[PDB]
């Protein structure tokens with residue numbers, strides 16, 4: 001089978017490290033400050049850590065036999081909690097597929113813009129590339145899965161190499177890169193970038209909703225709990241270590257990109273300030289550059305305007321593009337196999353008879369082709385809207401709802417003293433799980449109150465329907 | 471004992487008819503349109519009608535013995551729903567006391583301003599008068615309750631006389647009243663006032679939130695269900711007829727004041743337009759008055775600026791002041807006797823052991839003096855804030871919460887097929903109750919999302935605590 005490392009840690013890191021690490025973290029650091037983005041990352045880390053503690057408590061309760069995160073949750077805490085969590089998580093993964101594919105397509109379109117290869121329009125090209133990508137990924141999922149075990153390590157190595165390449169690039173200031181920002185590690189840039197600089201229609205929690213899908217993916221290790229040799233011990237430590245490593249990398253990258261790149265920058269070489277005019281207080285002014293004229297007009301570079309800041313900073317640019325592709329495609333593929341399997345397992349249990357027609361599977365491996373079609377349609381529908389910053393809040397809402405369900409389910413089972421609930425995890429507390437559920441609920445209401453209200457209305461309706469069923 | 475007219479209908483109408491009907495309905499008609507105010511009244515009427523159907527189902531379920539709405543709810547529908555509903559309703563009545571007393575104090579200060587009798591400040595005078603009024607009302611509730619049976623009829627007669635006096639006043643246009651608006655029943659004024667004219671920080675639901683406490687008070691007939699001769703027949707028809715009559719009066723008054731008084735008006739006599747300037751399209755311009763110059767400056771008269779439009783329109787001004795006092799004081803007294811009784815009944819059941827110290831009662835009639843002190847403190851604290859337009863949304867939030875609890879609890883009992891749930895009401899449907907609960911929840915999030923979220927988190931915490939208790 002799979003050892004704890006290759007079965008939980010690698011998959012969790014690959015699912016967590018997705019689209020926001022490379023093409024949105026720098027923008028988040030620009031919009032907030034360095035310290036305030038550290039606060040955002042810490043809040044997401046607290047949410048995912050409490051959810052991971054709850055998930056480990058679920059894993060340590062019961063028997064090894066049985067695979068899938070929905071299976072463990074349903075056999076541990078109630079048909080009603082199992083069904084609600086499974087449905088919400090399946091929808092969350094289905095829309096996460098779209099978010100990751102849109103990030104990949106945006107990166108591809110940005111790379112094509114360098115060669116001036118435009119087919120119809122930037123948004124239209126993003127839509128076309130996303131549709132092609134999701135079709136290809138669905139074909140890969142339904143046809144080729146034996147290569148996945150060998151490809152996980154390759155993708156993780158490529159992503160780590162891209163991260164190291166960016167970190168190396170931050171330590172090599174270049175004169176050519178200076179007009180586009182990236183003056184190197186300077187105290188002036190750190191001082192300027194420490195405070196928030198939110199623009200119009202940008203707040204702390206909008207940026208948090210953009211970032212939060214980065215922290216998601218912690219349930220990748222539990223999704224193949226059956227495939228693990230010792231799921232009761234592999235899942236807890238694997239998930240917790242993956243959360244720790246990804247959070248440390250996020251914090252380090254945020255601080256580095258905030259301390260090495262200015263918020264606003266032009267892209268023209270002959271912008272130097274030989275004689276200071278009125279003693280400009282900007283960090284770029286102290287670095288012999290004049291970006292004061294940029295803020296009046298639209299800027300095309302800097303933390304606030306360029307989503308490919310990390311690609312620019314890195315010494316070997318195509319490695320980062322491979323890293324972006326690796327991260328986005330790995331996360332999209334992980335979410336594209338998690339949702340159909342969860343939906344099929346939910347339909348086998350016949351929790352909702354309306355969805356029972358999706359229980360049919362085809363092939364030797366019992367592939368949920370009907371479920372695959374449903375998740376493909378959901379992902380495609382969310383790809384026809386081709387903005388990462390509008391899709392990401394939806395991902396945040398649904399993953400926060402799933403995490404609140406998991407935390408509240410374990411807390412309610414501990415409080416009710418359910419006969420089948422006796423977790424063996426040492427670091428699980430029912431009150432910390434309740435705190436995590438409350439935090440997720442409050443955060444998802446703060447991000448978007450009506451979307452959250454609709455989510456809870458649906459969740460309560462499903463819970464009541466399953467509770468009172470024939 | 472008490473019949474359905476003097477025991478349900480009269481008290482329900484007296485509790486429903488309060489501060490808004492007299493000092494905020496004209497302002498609501500000004501802010502919204504005539505049609506939009508009619509829509510507001512219809513939405514409130516739908517909410518209260520569904521809640522009344524649920525309450526009638528509760529009343530028809532069970533046995534006659536036992537008094538108080540909380541008693542019927544708890545005996546019919548669980549200890550958990552009963553306790554949550556009782557606590558939320560007690561808090562709602564405690565803050566409604568403050569709302570009604572603040573409205574009375576605002577009317578008193580407005581009357582005193584005519585004689586230029588100012589003690590400290592308008593807000594400070596409102597606060598002082600409200601504190602004195604709530605102290606006197608608490609003393610009345612503690613000591614004198616035998617007069618109340620003979621006082622309900624007198625208060626209702628006075629209020630109806632005030633309503634009729636206003637309606638008569640609308641039919642007697644006067645030259646002296648014309649500068650302050652009130653040009654009589656004219657088609658020009660109706661056409662102008664039909665469309666919304668919301669000001670800054672005023673929306674449909676903020677106006678709805680301000681109006682909604684007017685429609686509340688439908689459970690006053692149920693709070694003395696023990697005192698009724700035949701509660702299972704007295705409560706349903708009495709409550710429904712009271713809702714119908716009050717809604718018809720609200721609609722008629724709204725249409726009348728919108729069709730007889732202009733939105734903005736000055737207060738100076740020599741404002742006449744002998745020759746039209748640029749063919750002014752305002753209704754007042756067509757009525758030989760020039761209020762165009764008023765819109766640039768702050769206006770002191772009209773629907774938008776005067777809260778005592780109905781007092782001005784009526785032929786006998788002191789009668790309306792008696793009507794305002796009668797309505798406000800009757801509703802405040804009803805809430806101030808409902809809240810302590812419900813809290814004491816809740817504390818007797820020992821649903822929440824933290825509140826058990828409030829179960830003690832003094833006197834021959836077992837007056838909850840400890841409970842009276844708590845509601846007096848809550849009302850006083852909400853009187854220290856002396857704006858009706860800010861207290862009223864809180865009242866809307868908490869009464870909508872109580873109504874959603876009642877509707878959802880009866881729907882859940884019907885769905886769960888509880889052993890003690892077998893309502894005899896012919897016009898009760900569980901799906902209509904569920905729709906009413908959903909409507910109340912959605913409306914209370916629309917009015918104020920974080921207040922509604924806090925209320926529902928508290929309600930869920932209470933429900934879970936009672937469910938899993940020793």
Ligand SMILES: CCCCCCCC/C=C/CCCCCCCC(=O)O[C@@H](COC(=O)CCCCCCCCCCCCCCC)COP(=O)([O-])OCC[N+](C)(C)C
Nearest residue numbers: 414415417430431432434435436438439442924927928931
């Ligand atoms: C903004 C985002 C942050 C969220 C803010 C709110 C965070 C609030 C978080 C709250 C978490 C609770 C922390 C209590 C810690 C006590 C430690 C202890 O030893 O107690 C002990 C007993 O004593 C108790 O039972 C604890 C009392 C819990 C009551 C909770 C109120 C909060 C509910 C919601 C408040 C709503 C707040 C809104 C208020 C308007 C432990 O209990 P036990 O039973 O012995 O455990 C054994 C179980 N076992 C046998 C299975 C092993």
Ligand SMILES: CCCCCCCC/C=C/CCCCCCCC(=O)O[C@@H](COC(=O)CCCCCCCCCCCCCCC)COP(=O)([O-])OCC[N+](C)(C)C
Nearest residue numbers: 458460461462464465468469874875878885907908911929
């Ligand atoms: C704080 C207090 C105030 C709270 C109020 C706040 C408002 C919150 C409101 C919360 C809403 C909760 C209402 C419960 C839902 C109805 C459940 C039900 O009746 O099932 C019944 C009917 O079943 C059906 O008729 C069809 C099943 C529909 C699935 C359920 C709703 C899903 C909502 C999402 C839709 C997603 C699609 C839309 C989005 C794309 C089951 O059949 P039965 O025979 O009647 O049961 C008897 C069984 N017994 C005999 C064993 C007992």
Ligand SMILES: CCCCCCCC/C=C/CCCCCCCC(=O)O[C@@H](COC(=O)CCCCCCCCCCCCCCC)COP(=O)([O-])OCC[N+](C)(C)C
Nearest residue numbers: 401404405408415437441459928930931932934935938939
């Ligand atoms: C997508 C969907 C996501 C859903 C998640 C998102 C929603 C999350 C919603 C979460 C709602 C919060 C639930 C909390 C549960 C209560 C804890 C409890 O049960 O009793 C605890 C005690 O607790 C106390 O002794 C304190 C008093 C009661 C606690 C507070 C309820 C009021 C909530 C705040 C009011 C503040 C008022 C402020 C006024 C200004 C446990 O004590 P025990 O002795 O161990 O119990 C033994 C019982 N047993 C033997 C059966 C085990």
Ligand SMILES: CCCCCCCC/C=C\CCCCCCCC(=O)O[C@@H](COC(=O)CCCCCCCCCCCCCCC)COP(=O)([O-])OCC[N+](C)(C)C
Nearest residue numbers: 457461884892893898899900901902904905906908909912
């Ligand atoms: C929030 C989004 C919606 C939430 C989920 C929707 C949940 C809907 C889920 C399931 C729908 C229920 C289907 C009923 C069939 C189930 C079996 C059954 O009970 O038969 C029923 C047939 O009743 C009907 O067939 C009428 C259909 C009712 C649909 C509306 C419920 C309110 C929706 C609100 C939408 C608000 C929209 C927003 C408003 C602002 C028979 O029951 P009964 O005979 O009537 O009971 C008599 C009891 N008695 C004997 C004591 C008198």
Ligand SMILES: CCCCCCCC/C=C\CCCCCCCC(=O)O[C@@H](COC(=O)CCCCCCCCCCCCCCC)COP(=O)([O-])OCC[N+](C)(C)C
Nearest residue numbers: 450451453454457673674675676863912915916917918919
């Ligand atoms: C999906 C179809 C639903 C149809 C049924 C419902 C009919 C439509 C119902 C209500 C319709 C109301 C439309 C908006 C009109 C303005 C309202 C307003 O006052 O602003 C408020 C919200 O409004 C917004 O934030 C605007 C953004 C659009 C969100 C719209 C409500 C979604 C309802 C989702 C329904 C989920 C369940 C769905 C059930 C099917 C916020 O104003 P505020 O100033 O921030 O408040 C602060 C208060 N304070 C100042 C005192 C602190």
Ligand SMILES: CCCCCCCC/C=C\CCCCCCCC(=O)O[C@@H](COC(=O)CCCCCCCCCCCCCCC)COP(=O)([O-])OCC[N+](C)(C)C
Nearest residue numbers: 203204205438439442443446447448449920921923924927
């Ligand atoms: C305590 C336990 C019990 C649970 C009850 C807890 C109750 C909650 C307590 C508190 C809730 C906060 C109340 C603030 C009132 C502002 C009103 C307002 O402006 O409306 C807006 C406020 O929603 C926002 O988006 C604002 C978020 C940033 C502002 C931050 C201030 C502190 C919020 C820190 C709060 C977290 C505290 C710590 C938690 C981590 C909403 O309208 P909108 O955003 O324009 O609509 C967006 C729609 N769209 C996305 C489609 C565009």
Ligand SMILES: CCCCCCCC/C=C\CCCCCCCC(=O)O[C@@H](COC(=O)CCCCCCCCCCCCCCC)COP(=O)([O-])OCC[N+](C)(C)C
Nearest residue numbers: 453456457459460463464467911926927929930933934937
């Ligand atoms: C924003 C949304 C607005 C609407 C929600 C507003 C809050 C609603 C507040 C109160 C409503 C009342 C609870 C809901 C209906 C429960 C009915 C039920 O199933 O009973 C069950 C018990 O229930 C429990 O054991 C604990 C309750 C957990 C319900 C959790 C759903 C989480 C969704 C959270 C989504 C909302 C998150 C809230 C914060 C935003 C089963 O009971 P039984 O089978 O009869 O067996 C009893 C055996 N006994 C007799 C021995 C004990």
Ligand SMILES: CC(C)CCC[C@@H](C)[C@H]1CC[C@H]2[C@@H]3CC=C4C[C@@H](OC(=O)CCC(=O)O)CC[C@]4(C)[C@H]3CC[C@]12C
Nearest residue numbers: 036039042043044046047195196197198202203204205
């Ligand atoms: C998850 C762990 C780390 C506990 C964190 C709890 C609090 C310490 C966090 C949760 C919500 C955070 C708040 C969320 C929103 C804001 C608004 C934010 O204001 C801005 O948007 C920037 C305005 C400006 O300074 O220019 C200031 C930080 C603050 C108060 C945050 C302060 C820190 C808070 C209270």
Ligand SMILES: CC(C)CCC[C@@H](C)[C@H]1CC[C@H]2[C@@H]3CC=C4C[C@@H](OC(=O)CCC(=O)O)CC[C@]4(C)[C@H]3CC[C@]12C
Nearest residue numbers: 159160161162163164165166167168169170171172249
């Ligand atoms: C893969 C990630 C997640 C973990 C590994 C982290 C390394 C990629 C980082 C951490 C410390 C960094 C080093 C910190 C200090 C330096 C010194 C710095 O200066 C030089 O040695 C000479 C530079 C030159 O002239 O080229 C060169 C980059 C380097 C090795 C950095 C290379 C990249 C390092 C090893």
Ligand SMILES: CC(C)CCC[C@@H](C)[C@H]1CC[C@H]2[C@@H]3CC=C4C[C@@H](OC(=O)CCC(=O)O)CC[C@]4(C)[C@H]3CC[C@]12C
Nearest residue numbers: 163167185186187188190248249250252253255256259
């Ligand atoms: C992916 C993660 C796990 C590894 C990356 C973490 C570190 C390699 C980065 C992140 C934060 C960076 C620090 C951010 C700020 C500074 C201040 C900087 O100070 C100056 O040189 C300016 C002072 C001056 O010369 O005047 C020294 C480099 C340093 C420590 C950076 C060193 C490299 C750090 C530690």
Ligand SMILES: CC(C)CCC[C@@H](C)[C@H]1CC[C@H]2[C@@H]3CC=C4C[C@@H](OC(=O)CCC(=O)O)CC[C@]4(C)[C@H]3CC[C@]12C
Nearest residue numbers: 506509510511512513514516665666667668673674675
């Ligand atoms: C039996 C009846 C009472 C059922 C009512 C259900 C709907 C017909 C009601 C419920 C919510 C109402 C809506 C609540 C909020 C608004 C926003 C409101 O916006 C404005 O204030 C526009 C101001 C302007 O015209 O300048 C317009 C009315 C409307 C759509 C209302 C239209 C009628 C709605 C949909």
Ligand SMILES: CC(C)CCC[C@@H](C)[C@H]1CC[C@H]2[C@@H]3CC=C4C[C@@H](OC(=O)CCC(=O)O)CC[C@]4(C)[C@H]3CC[C@]12C
Nearest residue numbers: 629630631632633634635636637638639640641642719
């Ligand atoms: C909640 C209850 C109190 C509502 C009762 C309705 C009456 C108060 C309204 C409904 C019809 C109205 C009547 C409609 C028509 C007229 C004719 C009208 O004739 C005149 O203009 C006489 C002029 C004058 O007397 O100087 C006098 C008002 C009056 C009686 C109105 C008086 C007030 C009435 C009776």
Ligand SMILES: CC(C)CCC[C@@H](C)[C@H]1CC[C@H]2[C@@H]3CC=C4C[C@@H](OC(=O)CCC(=O)O)CC[C@]4(C)[C@H]3CC[C@]12C
Nearest residue numbers: 633637655656657658660718719720722723725726729
């Ligand atoms: C407490 C309530 C139930 C008492 C009943 C209310 C009626 C006495 C009021 C409310 C609406 C009023 C109506 C609102 C608008 C008009 C239009 C108005 O039209 C004209 O005057 C046209 C003449 C012109 O301007 O040339 C005639 C009076 C009338 C029917 C009003 C008659 C008196 C009404 C019915």
Ligand SMILES: [Cl-]
Nearest residue numbers: 018019020214
């Ligand atoms: Cl991501």
Ligand SMILES: [Cl-]
Nearest residue numbers: 216217218219
């Ligand atoms: Cl996840």
Ligand SMILES: [Cl-]
Nearest residue numbers: 488489490684
């Ligand atoms: Cl009122």
